[PDB]
Amino acid sequence: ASSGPAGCQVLWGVNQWNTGFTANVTVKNTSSAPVDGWTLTFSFPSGQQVTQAWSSTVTQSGSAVTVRNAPWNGSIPAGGTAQFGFNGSHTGTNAAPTAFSLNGTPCTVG
């Protein structure tokens, strides 16, 4: 990025039992723009493949990931946060990498 995109932040709230790990994610935008929905992107290192989802249009591309949060569940002003969750299965390894990337801008984990 030869300019100065955003740099929001998304935290993770995992909650698994035998292997299925839920994921309570909370976005945090502090850049400086009216976030009326968005599409972040990154990927799952281990075999973390999401299945269910709400308040977030998740999409696993082979092994990577992307989430198009609807406009309603994504109507937060540059000074606020958003939140969504899903249920993915794994095998016991590393999931949430680090700084994902909003639709056109980076985003450091929370």
- 33 three-class SS: coil
CB 46 within 8 A of CB 94: yes
Cα 10 from chain centroid (whole Å): 6
CA nearest to 37, candidates 108, 104, 110, 109: 104
Residue 74 phi, psi (nearest 5): -145, 35
Residue type, 35: V
Q: How far is CA 9 from CA 83, 92, 106, in A?
A: 11, 24, 8
Determination approach: NMR
- Residue 41 half-sphere exposure, CB side, CA atoms within 13 Å? 7
- 73 three-class SS: helix
The residue behind tokens 């929370």 is 110
- 72 three-class SS: helix
Answer whether CATH 1.10.630.10 is correct for domain 1-110. Answer: no
